Amino acid sequence: ALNSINTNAGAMIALQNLNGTNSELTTVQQRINTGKKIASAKDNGAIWATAKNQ
C-alpha cells in the first residue's frame, strides 16, 4: 500500500538477495576448504562417480 505499517516487500526482497549471496559464499568457501570443484556427490554426480572409479 506504500504506507502499510504491517508489511513491506522491500525488506523481503532484500532478505532474499542477501540469502542468495550467503549461499554463494558457502559454495566458494567449500571450494577453498576442499581444494576442488566437485568434492561431494552433490556438486556433480556424474563427474564425481567417474573420478572415484578412475
Partner: protein, 55 residues
C-alpha cells in the same frame, strides 16, 4: 460519488492480478534455471567417447 466507490472496488482486483503474476514469475525463474541445467546434462551426454556407466 457512486463511481468513486466503484473505483475503490476496482483497485483490489488490479492488485490481485499483480500478485498472481508475481507467483508465476518466481516459478518461471526456477524453471529457466532447471532448463539450463538440463541442456548442460544433455550436451555432456551427447559424447560418443563416454563409458557405458556414465551415460
Amino acid at each position: 460519488s457512486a463511481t468513486a466507490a466503484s473505483m475503490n472496488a476496482v483497485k483490489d482486483s488490479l492488485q490481485r492480478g499483480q500478485s498472481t503474476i508475481d507467483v508465476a514469475l518466481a516459478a518461471g525463474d526456477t524453471i529457466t534455471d532447471l532448463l539450463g541445467k538440463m541442456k548442460e546434462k544433455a550436451l555432456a551426454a551427447s559424447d560418443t567417447s563416454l563409458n557405458t556407466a556414465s551415460f
